[PDB]
Design a protein around this ligand. Structure first.
Ligand code: ZN
Length: 46
């Protein structure tokens, strides 16, 4: 019944999607993007 978490407790950042643990929020929020996106950037793209 809404139990498990006790006061302030470190929160890990796992991506069930693939299964990777990170520390910096940016790593996750950013990583998520990697998943989406295909056939967009080809050869000599800049
Ligand atoms: Zn992932």
């Amino acid at each position: 019944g809404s139990s498990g978490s006790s006061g302030s407790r470190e929160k890990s950042h796992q991506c069930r999607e693939c299964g990777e643990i990170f520390f910096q929020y940016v790593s996750l929020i950013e990583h998520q993007v990697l998943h989406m996106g295909q056939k967009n950037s080809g050869p000599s793209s800049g």
